[PDB]
Amino acid sequence: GKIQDSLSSTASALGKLQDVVNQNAQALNTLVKQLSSNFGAISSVLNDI
């Protein structure tokens, strides 16, 4: 019962899994956003340039 209550009332108990998920999500977001960079081109869109 005590461990159940601690898990219910504590938000940092599952820090490891949430941190791993957040790291993966932010890595994916950074990879997606890297496309926005033009690297000297007029626009990042291949068709437009």
Partner 1 sequence: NFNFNGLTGTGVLTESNKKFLPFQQFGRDIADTTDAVRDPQTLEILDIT
Shortest separation between residue 4's beta carbon and partner 1, angstroms: 34
> Nearest distance from residue 32's CB to partner 1, in Å?
5
Query: CB of 28: closest distance to partner 1 in angstroms?
Result: 9
- Kindly tell me which of 9 and 47 has the beta carbon lying closer to partner 1: 47
> Which one, of 25, 46, 47, lies nearest residue 33 by Cα?
25
Contacts with partner 1, residue ranges (CB under 8 A): 29, 32-33, 36, 45, 47-48
Whole-angstrom CA distances from 37 to 7, 8, 19, 30, 40 are 43, 44, 27, 11, 8
